[PDB]
Amino acid sequence: VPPGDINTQPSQKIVFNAPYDDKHTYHIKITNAGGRRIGWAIKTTNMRRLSVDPPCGVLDPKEKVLMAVSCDTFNAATERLNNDRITIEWTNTPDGAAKQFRREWFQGDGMVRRKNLPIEYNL
């Protein structure tokens, strides 16, 4: 069956504040707003600058995880600011699955749901 939804905080996007002369580490609360257990994974678009940790996990119904999105120093006057975003994928976990993330959940026949959280740089 299709995966239920998640809630994230923040909900629509993530904003990083100048100054960018130091590394900053923001968070994201991901909550599983559905009726079944889900496995989830995270990407970002700019991996020399931006990071994610942990890059995946499992989440029972109503269960939450706090996730760290890091942003390294960079010259905000000079470098790319524009098409960055975080991407969360999840799917329902197979029947009788353990609570350790398995990439092959994402690969066989099934459904994958995603949500993007664009990054904004507040200069």
UniProtKB/Swiss-Prot annotation:
Any single GO CC term annotated in Swiss-Prot or TrEMBL for this entry: cytoskeleton
Compartments it resides in: Cell projection, Pseudopodium; Cytoplasm, Cytoskeleton
Tissues expressing the protein: Sperm.
Keyword vocabulary terms for this entry: Acetylation, Cell projection, Cytoplasm, Cytoskeleton
SUPFAM superfamilies in UniProt: PapD-like
Keyword Acetylation assigned: yes
Glycoprotein among keywords: no
MSP domain boundaries: 5-122
Primary localisation category: other
Function: Central component in molecular interactions underlying sperm crawling. Forms an extensive filament system that extends from sperm villipoda, along the leading edge of the pseudopod.
Subunit description: Forms filaments 10 nm wide, with a characteristic substructure repeating axially at 9 nm.
Family matches, as PANTHER family: MAJOR SPERM PROTEIN, MSP DOMAIN-CONTAINING PROTEIN-RELATED
Protein name: Major sperm protein isoform alpha
Source organism of the structure: Ascaris suum (Pig roundworm)
